[PDB]
Structures are given as structure tokens and as C-alpha cells.
């Protein structure tokens, strides 16, 4: 129950403090003992929640970024009934680099809510995006395999898509959350909204997250913890640390 009292302390101090109202998320920061192996790129790997949802694709504004020609992409995703109301805007990379420059990029950041791009263009994406999006780790775009078809060696790649599959993929990544792999010991992960759900949801959230990150299997995503997790601190971006689970 000490965890829950500390969460009560955090949320009530969030109510009183003028700065703490103006940032509206909760981050769990973990310190373990050992440094982690994989170098820090910027592919946010996802983490599942089992009992509690977090956000809705029918609740956030979405940007999609394509391959080059984007014609069948835009028209099919617009016209075929599973994604007709989903994405705010679809645009290709070349069209983006032509269209937005500097202050226009900052206006994009101010306006749009969550960004997803094709896997085959994520590697180049942050260079046209710059580092205003790449301040820290909130608005990191994800990557989505569009066609449910795989390119073998020495064979021409087939173009297709399906709104079915892309809608399921967005509903997964918007239901549950994502973390970033590092090299140093300390790490951070966004968990939950202060009003969208409550303290039991947050505790169950933390339990499932630490369980999925402790589990030995599912290794490309969930085997991130090496050594023992020392402690978990709950904090906002502008609040302070509250210590739980110290051993």
C-alpha cells in the first residue's frame, strides 16, 4: 500500500503545483544494477498491457508516412471503410521534405498527435524530421509493416496493403505502450494518464510492465532487464522522484 500512498502524494502535489498541472503524464523510471547491451537507436519497442487499455486510435490524431508514390496508399486507406476516419493525414517523405521547412516543421509538431511511418522509411525519417521531434523520447514515430508480405532475397517486392491489418496494428500500438532500449543502467517509460484512469490501473500497469520486462522469453522486445531491478521511481517530467520497491 506504500506504493499507492506515494501515488496519492504524487497526484495531489500535481494538483497543487502550478507547473505540475501543465504537464500531464506519468513516467516510471527504473534503476537496475547492470548496463544494457544494445546501443540506443530510436526504434521504440512496444510493451503490452493485459487488462487495461490506455488510448484510442479513435481518440488521437495520426500522421502516416509512406513509400514514394503513395497513390494506392492514400486512396485505399482513405476510401476503404476501416481507416476512413482513422488517420488525420497521409503524406510521402519526398512530399514532406518539399512541403515543410523549419517553422513549418515546428508547426507540425505543435499540431499532430502521433506519427507512424512505414518500416522501409523509418530509417531515413528523423533526418527530414530534425531534432525538434527528437528532443527526448515522447513523439518518436513507430514503424508498421504495411502489406503483410515479406521480401525474399533476389525477388521483386510486391506492393499491396490492407486496411484490416493496418487498423489492427494501430489499435495495438495505441492500446499499449512503448519503451526505448539504452546502454546505461537507468531507463524510463511513460505509463498512463492522471485522469484517463486511476491508481489501481496504474499499479496493475506497473506490475504487467515489470513482469513483461523481466520475462526471459519474447527476447527481441521483452528481455530487456539484465541483472536485478534495484528500484522504481514514479515521477512526471517536472515533478520529483517517489521511491518504491527498493529491494
Amino acid at each position: 500500500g506504500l506504493a499507492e500512498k506515494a501515488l496519492k502524494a504524487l497526484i495531489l502535489q500535481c494538483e497543487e503545483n502550478p507547473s505540475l498541472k501543465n504537464d500531464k503524464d506519468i513516467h516510471i523510471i527504473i534503476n537496475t544494477g547492470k548496463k544494457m547491451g544494445i546501443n540506443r537507436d530510436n526504434i521504440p519497442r512496444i510493451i503490452p498491457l493485459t487488462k487495461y487499455k490506455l488510448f484510442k486510435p479513435r481518440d488521437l490524431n495520426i500522421l502516416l508516412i509512406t513509400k514514394d508514390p503513395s497513390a494506392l496508399y492514400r486512396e485505399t486507406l482513405t476510401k476503404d471503410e476501416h481507416t476512413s476516419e482513422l488517420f488525420k493525414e497521409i503524406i510521402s517523405v519526398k512530399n514532406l521534405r518539399r512541403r515543410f521547412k523549419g517553422s513549418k516543421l515546428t508547426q507540425l509538431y505543435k499540431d499532430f498527435d502521433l506519427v507512424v511511418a512505414d518500416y522501409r522509411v523509418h530509417h531515413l525519417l528523423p533526418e527530414v524530421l530534425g531534432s525538434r521531434f527528437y528532443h527526448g523520447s515522447k513523439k518518436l514515430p513507430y514503424m508498421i509493416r504495411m502489406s503483410k508480405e515479406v521480401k525474399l532475397k533476389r525477388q521483386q517486392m510486391v506492393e499491396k496493403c490492407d486496411p484490416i491489418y493496418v487498423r489492427a496494428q494501430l489499435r495495438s500500438i495505441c492500446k499499449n505502450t512503448s519503451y526505448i532500449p539504452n546502454n546505461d543502467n537507468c531507463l524510463s517509460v511513460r505509463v498512463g494518464y492522471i485522469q484517463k484512469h486511476s491508481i489501481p490501473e496504474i499499479l496493475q500497469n506497473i506490475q504487467d510492465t515489470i513482469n513483461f520486462l523481466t520475462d526471459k522469453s519474447k527476447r527481441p522486445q521483452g528481455g530487456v532487464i539484465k541483472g536485478g531491478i534495484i528500484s522504481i521511481f514514479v515521477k512526471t517530467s517536472n515533478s520529483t522522484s517517489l521511491p518504491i520497491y527498493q529491494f
Binding site: 500512498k5 502524494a9 520529483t240 522522484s241 517517489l242 521511491p243
Partner: peptide
């Protein structure tokens, strides 16, 4: 009444070092 005591801990830790 937890927040003030833990920020107390932060301050006193640093000045103790």
C-alpha cells in the same frame, strides 16, 4: 504528506555529500 519529506531527503543527501 510524503512529497516534502522525500525532497527533504534529496536536499540533505546532496549537502551531506
Amino acid at each position: 504528506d510524503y512529497y516534502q519529506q522525500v525532497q527533504r531527503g534529496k536536499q540533505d543527501k546532496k549537502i551531506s555529500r
